[PDB]
Amino acid sequence: TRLSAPVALAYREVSTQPRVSTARDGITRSGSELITTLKKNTDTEPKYTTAVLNPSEPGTFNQLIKEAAQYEKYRFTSLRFRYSPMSPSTTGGKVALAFDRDAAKPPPNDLASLYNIEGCVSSVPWTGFILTVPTDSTDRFVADGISDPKLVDFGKLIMATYGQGANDAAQLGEVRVEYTVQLKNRTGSTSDAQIGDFAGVKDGPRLVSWSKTKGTAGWEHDCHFLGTGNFSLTLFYEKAPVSGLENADASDFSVLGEAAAGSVQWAGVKVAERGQGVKMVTTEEQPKGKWQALRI
Amino acid sequence: GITRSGSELITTLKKNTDTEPKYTTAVLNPSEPGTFNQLIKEAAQYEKYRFTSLRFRYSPMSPSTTGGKVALAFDRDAAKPPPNDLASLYNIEGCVSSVPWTGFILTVPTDSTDRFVADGISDPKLVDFGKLIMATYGQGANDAAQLGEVRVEYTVQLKNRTGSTSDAQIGDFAGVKDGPRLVSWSKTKGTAGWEHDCHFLGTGNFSLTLFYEKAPVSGLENADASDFSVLGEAAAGSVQWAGVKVAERGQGVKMVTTEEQPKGKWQALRI
Amino acid sequence: TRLSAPVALAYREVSTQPRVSTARDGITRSGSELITTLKKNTDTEPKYTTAVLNPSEPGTFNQLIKEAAQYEKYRFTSLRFRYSPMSPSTTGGKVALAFDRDAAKPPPNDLASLYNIEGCVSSVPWTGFILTVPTDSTDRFVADGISDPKLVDFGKLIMATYGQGANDAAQLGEVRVEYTVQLKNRTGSTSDAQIGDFAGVKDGPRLVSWSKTKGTAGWEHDCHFLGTGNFSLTLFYEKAPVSGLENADASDFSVLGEAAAGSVQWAGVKVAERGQGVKMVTTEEQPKGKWQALRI
Amino acid sequence: GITRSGSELITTLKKNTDTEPKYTTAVLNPSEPGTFNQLIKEAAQYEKYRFTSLRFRYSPMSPSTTGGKVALAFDRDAAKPPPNDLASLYNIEGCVSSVPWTGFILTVPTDSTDRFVADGISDPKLVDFGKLIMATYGQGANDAAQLGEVRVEYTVQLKNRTGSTSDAQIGDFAGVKDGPRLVSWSKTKGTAGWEHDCHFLGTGNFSLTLFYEKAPVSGLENADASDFSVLGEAAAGSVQWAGVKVAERGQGVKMVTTEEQPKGKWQALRI
């Protein structure tokens, strides 16, 4: 029979209270976080935005990272993502949420493959839906350095948007996690400041992801920030580089320092959307030095 | 024997701004590239099937202010051509229609008979389980470009087993063709000469390689494909390697030789 | 009190199963059919579209025609028309359904007269309504040739649209019959292919309706098709005409034949909307020949 | 979820006159072209597996007058090099051997742990179930050229469906590879220039297409493949399209050039 269509739907969101408790082996923390807000995509093919599901991941969790710094292993006993619409009912396209159990595989390339992923749900941008992912009973190590994501990460969420019109809402919605993790073991509190050289060494929370790319001037190392917020980045060059730190696509980038042998720079980068970063240029592939990312 | 449930995207319906309804069909056979993109790989290794459970879903994609309608019906005779008037379509058993901005479902009762996986030359009444008819009509000029997506949620029982069928459809200009029915060529004489053009029955990224024994009038050229990029060199005794992106069925590329049934070889793949 | 207005209303339509049964005198068939889809009318005065209510009428019934070819008389024990909206709630104008018990009277000429018809219902294009027509207990002959519609036809439905804006939905809705006919008597199965000459003879289902019109070149006979679908039309000219068969306002017209004395043509006309047809020109009023309409 | 059973053909063993074993391993992962020729296509659609059952049958093919021995062993570590002496080979759990003209079967007890489908980059200890080792030795100087064959009868549970991986391998001479690991490239500075060798890790009919930005010194040449038919001409901006039939793993085709990293792209295919 008849089924009406509203002009818009309003969801009231209130920050709940995390439920912490103590068990025999560790603690059991429940809560909810905000990952990101989906943006309009005026193209038929999807545009993806990923978020690795693992405590101590600044991009995904904001408060569970601190509570997971005191523990060594985890087990997501129950997690579930929710979508809150903030666009009228006259917006086209679609929104798709899928959970890839492999955290290294890149997101698919065509819409047909996106729908083959198990559990992939989707709906119109102006209505809310929930994707609940079955969990398992395997303990994994909280991220601590450069390790295979198959061995530490539980999975990776994939958010896609497509099919929206030209004159549509700028932002369609926002995803929200609802987890219940089982932190186990215990250890001396670990610092939260990724530190590593340019030879592929990393030690700490995954705040940064460097990527070389050969160019006419030299090898360009791009410091992509996985989270969204205020960061600081100290660099130490052993050999004089072609150029210091430059704003690639981030917002409000400032650097106090100089580029030269033995010199140290100090950049207070600011990120408005996950993936933005800075860049530097050198003539030596795999240069010698250090860097330190921090959430300041 | 193997049971493989799943869900796949057949196509995405598009606006019908003209007056006559537009009908798009998709034969329900596990080896059909038009309707299946993942079960085809599994069915290539089997020579019998039975659809334990079949059902189709329509997922809206258009604004709430979209006119017209969309219909979904299942015809058990895969040979019959698509209907000619709307009343006959609505007279098919279990035909479900609704406005573009809302989704619905169409459950297809299934029998307990086995059929040979399609090879492309057998009677459709003997191999195919049926076909699906998707109708779109009554849309104005102010409506969205895309209405929705049709998907098939199935549960097949592939039986027996055999040598895997070739993943690439090799063939020969105006001659024999082997492998999955990915493309189909056609010829029409013209001013420059005989024009050979191919049509891609599937949708996705393809890879067409060609070999000319004699210098053609012209090399590969986009006809109506979404994207196109040739990387070869048209000439006598040469090969042209091209990549074609197809958004809707029937899109393809073309060539000119001026000699009917030119001697050569072509290969098609769904990269 | 308050009464909300949706952006649009969605009606789910599923093809039901006809209910056939056997009685003492014949059979009693129940079912539902689709007549047509109403189109926008950006004019104050109405625009009409008629459908004669009689089994063996290709324009109205599509499946009951076959079941009524084996019977001689009928009685609509219960019929009722329904309107399904497929336009947003921002469309103006109105839609009117009326049942004229005289199947020959032309539709009215002004909106005032349309509302004097008994039982005439109407509503906004974006909402559904039902017009149920009282029936009687009189048996009538199933249409078989050229006969007075007062004697064979039960009635005639009239559908009108008007008042829509310029930027409104192209099509407003679609009507749908819901009948319960009582077929009686019985006879050898009759063919479905109207056949007749140009002297006013017709024998078979009412698929075509010729109409003369004097012109400068000659008398033009227009072959209006009452239904909508694929048709074929074979013509036989005894005297050479001015011109053969030409596409008047139909779609996808093709003819295999020649125009000359004794020659025969064969036109596979195709109709997208009821009323479209082809035409031919002759210098002789009431020419000698034959024609045969068929649903191929 | 899905469960499949099959019986593939790994390889055919060859005579070894030397009394010391000559090993040929075969990593056991569903997405391994060297081992599985049909399971790879359905494993590309899933990202986890669990071998419920597993056996390796050696089917003799040599006459009754051939000496020596043939041994099949299963090493649960897929990175350990094959042993260096007979005693170490026979210390492996479950190792079974016999004279070439007598058949035997090796049953490998399984476990209840799910492993990620191999990507070729991850640790073999973390994604590979094991590694089969086949050895031969002691044959006389006038025995049959090729001994029996080896087949794998399995029952694998694939889980966690996902987007299908490309069925054709597309790569670049700069070290880029994205596909089902069907080919490997190497460099060896000869006398005419940097020579690129293309060793096929599978066994069967193939199809290699290359695009040259600059004219190479020479086109594809049959290094040790059973068959090789090249189509097209080698030159600047040209494309070649060869069909190679491979009977033993490692057989490849050479192409010499004056540049260590020639600009272009290739495409391997198991036609």
XYZ file of C-alpha atoms in Angstrom, chain B residues 1-7 37-38 41-42 45-46 161-170 207 209-211 231-233 236-241 265-267 269-271, chain D residues 1-8 37-39 41-42 45-46 161-164 166-170 207 209-211 231-233 237-241 265-267 269-271:
84
model
C 28.902 -30.821 -6.583
C 29.024 -27.357 -5.035
C 26.462 -24.971 -3.529
C 27.312 -21.278 -3.945
C 24.915 -18.663 -2.618
C 25.643 -15.026 -3.325
C 24.410 -11.652 -4.503
C 30.185 -11.403 -13.008
C 31.442 -13.843 -10.340
C 34.035 -18.032 -13.201
C 32.752 -20.913 -11.067
C 34.314 -25.395 -14.462
C 30.922 -27.149 -14.268
C 32.911 -31.032 -13.315
C 35.089 -30.576 -16.397
C 38.052 -28.732 -17.855
C 37.831 -25.030 -17.085
C 36.542 -22.987 -20.009
C 38.897 -20.368 -21.412
C 38.814 -17.064 -19.539
C 39.550 -15.153 -22.775
C 37.339 -15.288 -25.874
C 39.681 -15.820 -28.802
C 41.070 -5.665 -23.225
C 43.878 -7.287 -28.943
C 43.863 -7.524 -32.735
C 46.085 -8.766 -35.555
C 48.620 1.369 -27.719
C 49.394 -0.427 -30.988
C 50.041 0.610 -34.590
C 50.152 -4.762 -42.442
C 51.182 -7.718 -40.300
C 50.861 -5.787 -37.029
C 48.859 -6.004 -33.796
C 46.787 -3.375 -31.977
C 46.262 -3.636 -28.211
C 42.709 -12.736 -35.161
C 41.195 -11.005 -32.136
C 41.125 -11.658 -28.392
C 39.119 -10.288 -21.999
C 37.366 -8.712 -19.008
C 40.299 -7.198 -17.120
C 31.290 -19.846 2.847
C 31.914 -22.607 0.317
C 33.415 -26.111 0.269
C 35.049 -27.608 -2.818
C 36.715 -30.919 -3.640
C 39.010 -31.539 -6.580
C 41.890 -33.532 -8.025
C 44.491 -31.398 -9.785
C 45.412 -24.657 -11.957
C 41.653 -24.591 -11.264
C 41.309 -23.756 -7.561
C 40.040 -19.027 -10.012
C 37.638 -19.689 -7.130
C 36.966 -14.681 -4.825
C 37.765 -15.490 -1.172
C 34.007 -13.638 -0.053
C 35.381 -10.468 -1.655
C 35.913 -8.712 -4.969
C 37.326 -11.036 -7.607
C 41.979 -9.884 -12.019
C 42.292 -13.066 -14.076
C 45.077 -11.551 -16.215
C 48.438 -10.339 -14.926
C 49.394 -6.817 -16.034
C 49.556 -15.596 -24.088
C 51.512 -9.283 -24.946
C 54.218 -6.614 -24.733
C 54.324 -2.938 -25.691
C 52.585 -12.359 -33.951
C 53.545 -8.819 -34.917
C 56.822 -6.999 -35.422
C 55.809 1.935 -30.308
C 54.877 -1.548 -31.536
C 53.119 -4.443 -29.808
C 53.822 -8.180 -29.859
C 51.474 -11.052 -29.040
C 53.878 -2.830 -20.141
C 53.215 -6.548 -20.570
C 50.273 -8.868 -19.939
C 47.416 -14.809 -19.570
C 46.616 -18.503 -19.108
C 44.712 -18.828 -22.370
